[PDB]
Ligand binder design. Sequence first.
Ligand SMILES: */C=C\C(=O)N[C@H]1COC[C@H]1Nc1ncc2cc(-c3c(Cl)c(OC)cc(OC)c3Cl)c(=O)n(C)c2n1
Length: 279
Amino acid sequence: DLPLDPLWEFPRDRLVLGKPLGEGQVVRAEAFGMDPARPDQASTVAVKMLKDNASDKDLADLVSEMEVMKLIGRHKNIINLLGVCTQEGPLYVIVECAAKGNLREFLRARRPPSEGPLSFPVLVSCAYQVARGMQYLESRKCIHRDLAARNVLVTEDNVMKIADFGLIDYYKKTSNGRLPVKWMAPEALFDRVYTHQSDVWSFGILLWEIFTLGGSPYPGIPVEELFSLLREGHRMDRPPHCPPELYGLMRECWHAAPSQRPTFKQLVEALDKVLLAVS
Ligand SMILES: */C=C\C(=O)N[C@H]1COC[C@H]1Nc1ncc2cc(-c3c(Cl)c(OC)cc(OC)c3Cl)c(=O)n(C)c2n1
């Protein structure tokens, strides 16, 4: 069915499929000897596969996702491709499994009922890692198109990993009540133009999500009211307990002209300066 890539082929009999993670469909699995330095050791991985009644187009999209991940290469702040099963059975695409779920849920669960465990330098470090991940993806000509705290995964060691960059319906409200239009740069929403600078805008919204501990952007504003506010050049206010250093960066990400927004490289440098100063 598919060509053999000996660089990425992982033996399917060395995978123990487990619990479903989402719906292609994703399952948790145990892989033996995924690390060449540890030949028989188990690791927990995430495996993407086709549904039972998948079409030839669904196969194409999954193969395409796999190929893009191969080309992008490896980085500590992205969900990495670990292996593939293409021979003598169904197509499996094996990636890193982050134990602590998406960043939005990670932040919300740590809201204090009092001081929370996520102090200011931890929140800056979180933002810094996301910017480092985006800087890597940009250097690999990857435009995310939906960067948000829900699309960042958190490992057992609290390492931030950009998810779902290997590719949506912006107007459909998700089961968790997310409206993706709220992360769209104006040139993407109004003019269908997606660039690395439109991801910079989305990064600004993600910065706002971090400093509100997973708040929902433009709080209590319906989508129809959002369009008019964006046309007037309205921007979210400085949220509670957010210092001007961080709100200033959010405002820079939200400059109307994409050429006036900082680059992912400048955001990495700016967040590193904040972290060195406070810590
Ligand atoms: C690690 C065990 C575990 O149960 N973790 C869960 C806690 O939150 C949800 C889940 N963690 C998790 N970690 C990584 C995921 C990766 C993907 C994913 C896949 Cl399968 C592919 O396949 C090509 C591509 C991706 O991005 C390019 C991603 Cl992000 C995933 O779909 N899920 C659900 C993951 N879940």
